[PDB]
């Protein structure tokens, strides 16, 4: 189907200062941070938008920290609590009254194995849309 207008080209989640003291036990995680992706002006014939997610994983499957803090994974979840690791998709129905589509997502840092170390956190998740 024809494409909508992508109205969120770039978004940034700043997790702030996390503490290794509280990222010691396996499975410890930061609070969730909200991020939304907006599509507008969906053309006639387009009833669904599918987002596809990419970026480098680490051994845990979650997105690799490209910064210096060790044992830090980055996790993206959808509105159903599903993890959107690299290669995942999420499909939303267009609201015909506004010809728009909204993707409410959340992000957190996670330590799968525990024992996070001090350092930076940096990652980028890319999103590419198909239309049907």
């Amino acid at each position: 189907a024809k494409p909508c207008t992508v109205s969120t080209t770039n978004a940034t989640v700043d997790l702030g200062d996390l503490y290794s003291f509280s990222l010691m036990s396996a499975g410890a995680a930061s609070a969730w941070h909200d991020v939304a992706l907006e599509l507008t002006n969906c053309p006639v014939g387009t009833s669904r938008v599918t987002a596809s997610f990419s970026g480098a994983a680490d051994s845990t499957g979650y997105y690799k920290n490209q910064g210096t803090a060790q044992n830090i994974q980055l996790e993206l979840q959808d509105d159903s609590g599903n993890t959107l690791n690299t290669g995942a998709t999420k499909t939303v129905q267009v609201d015909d009254s506004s010809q728009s589509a909204h993707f409410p997502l959340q992000v957190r840092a996670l330590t799968v194995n525990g024992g996070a170390t001090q350092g930076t956190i940096e990652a980028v998740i890319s999103i590419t849309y198909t239309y049907s």
Binding site: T9, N10, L18, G119, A123, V124, I127
Partner: peptide, 10 residues
């Protein structure tokens, strides 16, 4: 679209 994630572990 791109989602950039930043932070520090202290």
């Amino acid at each position: 679209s791109r989602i950039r994630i930043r932070g520090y572990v202290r």
